[PDB]
Design an enzyme around this catalytic site. Sequence first.
Site, PDB file in Angstrom:
ATOM      1  N   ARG A  45      -7.961   1.304   7.349  1.00  0.00           N
ATOM      2  CA  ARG A  45      -6.588   1.275   7.266  1.00  0.00           C
ATOM      3  C   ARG A  45      -5.911   2.514   7.441  1.00  0.00           C
ATOM      4  O   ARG A  45      -6.652   3.154   6.722  1.00  0.00           O
ATOM      5  CB  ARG A  45      -6.292   0.316   5.919  1.00  0.00           C
ATOM      6  CG  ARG A  45      -4.943   0.542   5.418  1.00  0.00           C
ATOM      7  CD  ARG A  45      -3.807   0.582   7.097  1.00  0.00           C
ATOM      8  NE  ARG A  45      -2.400   0.673   5.809  1.00  0.00           N
ATOM      9  CZ  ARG A  45      -0.911  -0.350   6.982  1.00  0.00           C
ATOM     10  NH1 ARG A  45      -1.445  -0.947   7.933  1.00  0.00           N
ATOM     11  NH2 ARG A  45       0.132  -0.244   6.174  1.00  0.00           N
ATOM     12  N   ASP A  98       3.839   0.537  20.461  1.00  0.00           N
ATOM     13  CA  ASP A  98       3.143   0.203  18.719  1.00  0.00           C
ATOM     14  C   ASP A  98       4.160   0.903  18.112  1.00  0.00           C
ATOM     15  O   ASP A  98       3.932   1.960  17.827  1.00  0.00           O
ATOM     16  CB  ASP A  98       1.730   0.475  18.739  1.00  0.00           C
ATOM     17  CG  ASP A  98       1.250   0.038  17.403  1.00  0.00           C
ATOM     18  OD1 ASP A  98       1.488  -1.098  16.550  1.00  0.00           O
ATOM     19  OD2 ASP A  98       0.488   1.066  16.349  1.00  0.00           O
ATOM     20  N   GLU A 146       1.651  -3.856   7.248  1.00  0.00           N
ATOM     21  CA  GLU A 146       0.611  -4.455   7.304  1.00  0.00           C
ATOM     22  C   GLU A 146       0.433  -5.716   7.970  1.00  0.00           C
ATOM     23  O   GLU A 146      -0.443  -6.519   7.718  1.00  0.00           O
ATOM     24  CB  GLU A 146       0.148  -4.466   5.774  1.00  0.00           C
ATOM     25  CG  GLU A 146       0.248  -3.473   5.568  1.00  0.00           C
ATOM     26  CD  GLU A 146      -0.925  -3.869   3.810  1.00  0.00           C
ATOM     27  OE1 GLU A 146      -1.224  -4.301   3.107  1.00  0.00           O
ATOM     28  OE2 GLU A 146      -1.553  -2.076   3.925  1.00  0.00           O
TER      29      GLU A 146
HETATM   30  N1  GDP Z   1      -8.815 -10.051   7.532  1.00  0.00           N
HETATM   31  C1  GDP Z   1      -8.104  -9.092   8.760  1.00  0.00           C
HETATM   32  N2  GDP Z   1      -8.261  -8.418   8.615  1.00  0.00           N
HETATM   33  C2  GDP Z   1      -6.589  -7.849   9.371  1.00  0.00           C
HETATM   34  C3  GDP Z   1      -6.099  -8.563  10.247  1.00  0.00           C
HETATM   35  N3  GDP Z   1      -5.345  -8.070  10.830  1.00  0.00           N
HETATM   36  C4  GDP Z   1      -5.205  -6.953  10.248  1.00  0.00           C
HETATM   37  N4  GDP Z   1      -6.240  -6.633   9.525  1.00  0.00           N
HETATM   38  C5  GDP Z   1      -6.748  -5.557   8.928  1.00  0.00           C
HETATM   39  O1  GDP Z   1      -5.346  -4.836   8.178  1.00  0.00           O
HETATM   40  C6  GDP Z   1      -4.866  -4.473   7.914  1.00  0.00           C
HETATM   41  C7  GDP Z   1      -3.108  -4.002   8.606  1.00  0.00           C
HETATM   42  O2  GDP Z   1      -3.288  -3.549   9.520  1.00  0.00           O
HETATM   43  P1  GDP Z   1      -2.366  -3.162  10.510  1.00  0.00           P
HETATM   44  O3  GDP Z   1      -2.757  -3.255  11.980  1.00  0.00           O
HETATM   45  O4  GDP Z   1      -2.531  -1.594  10.372  1.00  0.00           O
HETATM   46  O5  GDP Z   1      -0.692  -3.639  10.127  1.00  0.00           O
HETATM   47  P2  GDP Z   1       0.459  -2.648  10.900  1.00  0.00           P
HETATM   48  O6  GDP Z   1       0.707  -1.659   9.689  1.00  0.00           O
HETATM   49  O7  GDP Z   1       1.133  -3.649  10.710  1.00  0.00           O
HETATM   50  O8  GDP Z   1      -0.275  -2.191  11.559  1.00  0.00           O
HETATM   51  C8  GDP Z   1      -5.667  -2.945   8.785  1.00  0.00           C
HETATM   52  O9  GDP Z   1      -6.585  -2.771   7.224  1.00  0.00           O
HETATM   53  C9  GDP Z   1      -7.051  -4.228   9.546  1.00  0.00           C
HETATM   54  O10 GDP Z   1      -7.544  -4.175   9.375  1.00  0.00           O
HETATM   55  C10 GDP Z   1      -6.821 -10.673   9.953  1.00  0.00           C
HETATM   56  O11 GDP Z   1      -6.194 -11.645  11.110  1.00  0.00           O
HETATM   57  N5  GDP Z   1      -8.046 -10.268   9.695  1.00  0.00           N
HETATM   58  F1  ALF Z   2       2.769  -1.142   8.131  1.00  0.00           F
HETATM   59 AL1  ALF Z   2       2.180  -1.100   9.803  1.00  0.00          AL
HETATM   60  F2  ALF Z   2       2.065  -0.184  11.394  1.00  0.00           F
HETATM   61  F3  ALF Z   2       3.976  -1.490   9.198  1.00  0.00           F
HETATM   62  F4  ALF Z   2       1.127   1.136   9.404  1.00  0.00           F
HETATM   63 MG    MG Z   3      -0.024   0.127  12.452  1.00  0.00          MG
END
Ligand code: GDP
Ligand code: ALF
Ligand code: MG
Lengths: 326, 196
Positions: A155, A177, A13
């Site tokens: 998400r 990714d 996340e």
């Molecule tokens: N408000 C806000 N939302 C963000 C930010 N970065 C990501 N998001 C949101 O937070 C959630 C997590 O992002 P995600 O890319 O899915 O994280 P990952 O699991 O590392 O891929 C998703 O709902 C994105 O829309 C940020 O800087 N600010």
């Molecule tokens: F929480 Al991830 F990509 F790391 F969806």
């Molecule tokens: Mg992701």
Amino acid sequence: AREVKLLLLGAGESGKSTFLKQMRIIHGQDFDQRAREEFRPTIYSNVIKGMRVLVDAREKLHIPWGDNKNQLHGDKLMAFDTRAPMAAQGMVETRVFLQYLPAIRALWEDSGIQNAYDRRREFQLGESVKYFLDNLDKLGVPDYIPSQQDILLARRPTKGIHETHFTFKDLHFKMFDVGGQRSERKKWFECFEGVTAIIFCVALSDYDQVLMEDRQTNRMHESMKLFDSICNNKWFTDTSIILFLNKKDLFEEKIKKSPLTICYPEYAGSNTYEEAAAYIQCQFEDLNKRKDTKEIYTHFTCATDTKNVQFVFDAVTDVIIKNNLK
Amino acid sequence: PGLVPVSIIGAEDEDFENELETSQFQSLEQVKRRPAHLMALLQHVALQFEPGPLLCCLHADMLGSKKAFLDFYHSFLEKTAVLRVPVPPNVAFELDVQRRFVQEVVQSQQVAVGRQLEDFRSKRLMGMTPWEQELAQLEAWVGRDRASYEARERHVAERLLMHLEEMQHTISTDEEKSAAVVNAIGLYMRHLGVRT
Ligand SMILES: Nc1nc2c(ncn2[C@@H]2O[C@H](COP(=O)(O)OP(=O)(O)O)[C@@H](O)[C@H]2O)c(=O)[nH]1
Ligand code: ALF
Ligand SMILES: [Mg+2]
């Protein structure tokens, strides 16, 4: 020379996938109207499930309702079956979403449910459900089409590795990714070959939240542990390591109310955006055991904001070039 | 080790239902018998730290039934050896009784071997170690046949030992230090039953 492999990493996340979308939007095929629609059934699924968690949070955390009439609205939502075929895939049809909109609008304006959302730091919940719950209006229309920002805020948990290609500044980027969860990291090692650069993403917003794998470990604490293992990996001694302190918009508004001592018992500073953010950045760069040879390129980003992502990525590409084609 | 149920439901918990619910590397005396598990450790070290201490311990304890001390002193204790290991100021000067010397070299490598096993453990948990897949898959194995398990371990070790051979351009810039390691690891693996 002109072949670049970049790895998006970080704990769960942190915003990794949000970045890819930004890349696709600013470099590759920007999202066509039909492409954005595909994000509708998932957006309706963030809303309804997010609420499911809130209502369960209310009863569990023992938060008195703001209207006992909404208790019948709460049941309707708990009734929703999440293991069904489409709902299991994290999707919700318009026909059915519209069948819950009434209970969702009501439960959303309730005072009890609101106090639950304010105490979210005690249970797993994506803070992006708030952006949608406040836009229930544009979502309650017949043929709703997610806007450019709606897609980014949507998400969806990512599992496995996702490769992407694109050309910018006459460089052929091979962007990968991955999923950040603990069980997802084993799959990372299949990509530690010839890495030109790594963008380790961190979420500033969760110095007060816990992991979802064990509801008993500070997220920010894991991020630091994960960074200390990557930044110091023998596989990356000659790899440009960029660090993105993401979610600065949510943090800037976070410090004001909830304290930062919830993550750094020794932080004697103040609850200021400037002072606290500057503290966290040092918490990380300090994990660098090779402060002499290895250099870390820190940045404060906001993955959901396109303009910011485009500015920061241009500064990242100038670094990759100076560190290779010199 | 003990599990606990979640209080409040998480929106994306079912997305990781079979990923949840997680002492194999507490001492070298424990893993030195497991060929596969050792190849996971042997990789981490050879790649991230200095293979000296760990290899030394393995080649040392390999003794237990002559000429071994001959090649041993030529690869670890030799003032010019490739896999030189930090030895006590005591024996450094002093260079049957062979027993005291070997024993005196091992004890000086305890702090290093111990400190790397811990580093591996740490990474293990975070999921930052390689071969966790094959490693785990070699754990959920049931059977009234004991000797059959050890059998597959040997084949796994082979797969890893080769995978670590073909691609080893990360041990160190030294094009020769890598030959010593692979060889050292090679020899010990052969003591367990790994084909080369
Ligand atoms: N408000 C806000 N939302 C963000 C930010 N970065 C990501 N998001 C949101 O937070 C959630 C997590 O992002 P995600 O890319 O899915 O994280 P990952 O699991 O590392 O891929 C998703 O709902 C994105 O829309 C940020 O800087 N600010
Ligand atoms: F929480 Al991830 F990509 F790391 F969806
Ligand atoms: Mg992701």
